[PDB]
């Protein structure tokens, strides 16, 4: 409570230009997004003549944050949920510093990310079933961290409703999942009351979806909340670069096993979407994240599906208009000619990096939950990639034994070689025994790891430490 407003800062607009904009339903706006009545404390008055035209970055300076605490809702959920306010230029290093010992969160083991459409979405049954089943299967095992925005809209709300569908019946009870929400301070309905000078921490946020009007209310659905600010009011799509940078930083350098480096497997999955989803995928691909698209979601899945493995050159603008009439139907009105043509750069950028994008067939390929697609993406972008080393190999298998995919284990053997010594498979078979899947230990015995030197005194003590609580 004494480390923040000291190491985490905020960015605001230091003067007003009152450009002639009505902000739809409203009474005049600067361009800052706020009004003259509430535009900081001295920023309402003009600071001499800095400039007669608005461009944010040249004049803005830094002031500390004022939004921190833990949100407790009236009746929706009687539990503690932490939230922090972050700036746009804040490095991810200090943010990870905040997560580990300032919030009491352990090191991640999986960093699946979910992005999708907000207030432009539609529902069908078996897609919902697939999404929910994949969510609980990936989140209940290991220490997977699911990263998603902040809002209660569509599949974005359904990820959380699946979270509590699993959490209502849980042996450990309380919170077995760490779901982090990311949103922009500008796009928050009930900001009044979320600001405190030093700290009070009731952080009351009633979910009043009726009075939101134009800014979607924050969900009651994410365990941790990240609320970014850039100086913009009601502008979505601002946190796209920062989210990608943060997830990357928490991807490669949070563990030091082996004495050099450990790269935690990471996948971002997209369902439906629009321009903001396109920007998210583009920034994610530029940073170096494997991405998977679930086909059939609508209006975004097919376009990426039928350009993923196709050559980049033949993808023309004309092809974009032929793809603009079937899966850009309801969003054609908001798309203008100067705005339509931005859909070819980002798609080309994502496609030409074929090592970080895969398509998940809904009907004919991988007819199962999202585990097969996610692990295929991880093995394609982890083992076959020219950048990653040999240390993380031991971690793809530890991830795979949880997903009980032994055909993939057979497949991955043929291209890697553990010529040094087979003894590196003892730690993974320790976890295989607790996961209890016998095909993996059968593979281990047929590979030739001898059980004579495996079970040691400390090894058997650790195995006896992890009996199944269900049995007597």
């Amino acid at each position: 409570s004494s480390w923040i407003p000291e190491n985490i800062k905020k960015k605001e607009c230091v003067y007003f230009v009152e450009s002639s904009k009505l902000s739809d339903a409203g009474k005049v706006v600067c361009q800052c997004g706020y009004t003259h009545e509430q535009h900081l404390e001295e920023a309402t008055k003009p600071h001499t003549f800095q400039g007669t035209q608005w461009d944010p970055k040249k004049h803005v300076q830094e002031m500390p944050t004022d939004a921190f605490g833990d949100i407790v809702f009236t009746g929706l959920s009687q539990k503690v949920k932490k939230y922090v306010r972050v700036s746009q230029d804040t490095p991810s290093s200090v943010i990870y510093h905040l997560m580990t010992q300032h919030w009491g969160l352990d090191v991640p083991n999986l960093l699946i990310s979910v992005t999708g459409g907000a207030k432009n979405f539609n529902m069908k049954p078996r897609l919902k079933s697939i999404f929910r089943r994949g969510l609980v299967k990936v989140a209940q095992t290991t220490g997977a961290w699911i990263i998603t925005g902040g809002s209660h809209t569509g599949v974005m709300k359904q990820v959380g409703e699946a979270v509590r569908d699993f959490s209502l019946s849980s042996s450990y009870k309380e919170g077995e999942l760490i779901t982090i929400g990311v949103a922009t301070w500008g796009t928050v309905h009930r900001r009044e009351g979320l600001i405190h000078p030093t700290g009070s921490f009731p952080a009351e946020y009633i979910l009043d979806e009726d009075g939101q009007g134009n800014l979607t209310c924050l969900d009651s659905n994410h365990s941790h909340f990240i609320l970014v600010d850039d100086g913009t009011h009601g502008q979505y799509g601002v946190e796209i670069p920062l989210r990608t940078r943060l997830e990357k930083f928490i991807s490669e350098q949070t563990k030091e096993r082996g004495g050099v480096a450990i790269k935690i497997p990471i996948v971002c999955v997209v369902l439906e979407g629009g321009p903001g989803t396109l920007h998210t995928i583009d920034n994610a691909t530029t940073n170096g994240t494997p991405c998977v698209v679930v086909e059939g979601s609508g209006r975004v899945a097919d376009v990426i599906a039928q350009v993923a493995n196709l050559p980049v050159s033949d993808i023309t603008i004309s092809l974009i208009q032929q793809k603009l009439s079937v899966f850009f139907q309801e969003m054609f009105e908001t798309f203008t000619e100067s705005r339509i043509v931005e859909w070819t750069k980002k798609i080309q950028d994502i496609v030409r990096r074929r090592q970080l994008l895969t398509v998940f067939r809904e009907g004919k390929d991988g007819q199962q939950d999202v585990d097969v697609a996610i692990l295929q993406a991880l093995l394609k972008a982890s083992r076959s990639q020219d950048h990653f080393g040999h240390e993380n190999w031991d971690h793809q298998l530890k991830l795979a034994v949880a997903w009980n995919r032994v055909d993939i284990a057979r497949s991955e053997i043929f291209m890697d070689e553990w010529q040094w010594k087979p003894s590196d498979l003892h730690p993974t078979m320790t976890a295989a025994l607790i996961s209890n899947k016998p095909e993996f230990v059968k593979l281990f015995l047929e590979n030739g790891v001898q059980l004579k030197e495996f079970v040691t005194w400390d090894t058997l003590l650790y195995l006896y430490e992890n009996l199944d609580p269900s049995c007597l």
């Binding site: 583009d282 920034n283 050559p311 980049v312 050159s313 043509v341 070819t344 950028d349």
Partner: protein
């Protein structure tokens, strides 16, 4: 029966511009600017650029007393790709632009030269046995890293006029061996001379490269490898490590395409 019918099903079911994009790098590094979309059908100059509003970031037109694309002294002021073209008053960089004009926050005017050296030392275990590659002889190429950087950088850069040493080979490296390697560094065949796909180029200037490929028959080949290493002492770098730079080296994305063509320097299988 149930799984053999499955194994039976599978097999009787059977029985436009691709040009440089890295130059037009979105989210230009070291600059807070975003680009308008310039598709792959919009890479050539003849196509009409409907939304052409390029950035004007220069942290100026310093064209006075400096003849661009001309023969001005021993400055390498000529473009090797034939005559240049001008678009109204502002000339266009051949191949493509990147998003910076003039000189920018760089060292000085002229070209952002590059001069990549390389050193080889035999692998000592007890007498100097060689660990070959899977197919052919993979000679132990080696690179160094900049003292404060996230990437491995060879001791090269913009060639200072009259010196030919880009301020990084003569310093923070071996001592008392400077004159010896300078003669060798100007004796070799190039890997590529021309504009190259990097997100750190300029519209008014570009990179002219000089490269030399040299192999030492012994790790004690005069003072080039043995005495040079014996007289080299940094004592300031926080981290140091030595590895053979195979496909595992995280160099520039610029350098991978250069190596794809420079693999013919030795003819070995990478």
């Amino acid at each position: 029966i149930s799984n053999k019918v499955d194994a039976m099903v599978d097999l009787l079911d059977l029985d436009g511009d691709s040009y440089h994009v890295n130059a037009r790098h979105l989210l230009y590094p070291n600059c807070p600017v975003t680009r308008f979309p310039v598709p792959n059908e919009k890479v050539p100059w003849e196509t009409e650029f409907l939304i052409y509003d390029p950035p004007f970031y220069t942290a100026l037109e310093p064209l006075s007393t400096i003849q661009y694309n001309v023969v001005d002294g021993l400055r390498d002021r000529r473009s090797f790709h034939g005559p240049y073209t001008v678009q109204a008053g502002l000339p266009l960089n051949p191949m493509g632009r990147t998003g910076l004009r003039g000189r920018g926050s760089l060292s000085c005017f002229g070209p952002n030269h590059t001069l990549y050296p390389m050193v080889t030392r035999w692998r000592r275990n007890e007498d100097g046995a060689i660990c070959r590659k899977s197919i052919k002889k993979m000679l132990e190429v080696l690179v160094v890293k900049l003292p404060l950087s996230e990437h491995w950088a060879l001791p090269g850069g913009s060639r200072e006029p009259g010196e030919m040493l880009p301020r990084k080979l003569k310093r923070i490296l071996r001592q008392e061996h400077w004159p010896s390697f300078e003669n060798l560094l100007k004796c070799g065949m190039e890997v590529y001379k021309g504009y190259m796909d990097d997100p750190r180029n300029t519209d008014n200037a570009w990179i002219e490269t000089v490269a030399v490929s040299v192999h030492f028959q012994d790790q004690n080949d005069v003072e080039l490898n043995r005495l040079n290493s014996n007289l080299h002492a940094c004592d300031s770098g926080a981290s140091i490590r030595w590895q053979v730079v195979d496909r595992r080296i995280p160099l520039y994305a610029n350098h991978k395409t250069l190596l794809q063509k420079a693999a013919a320097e030795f003819g070995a299988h990478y």
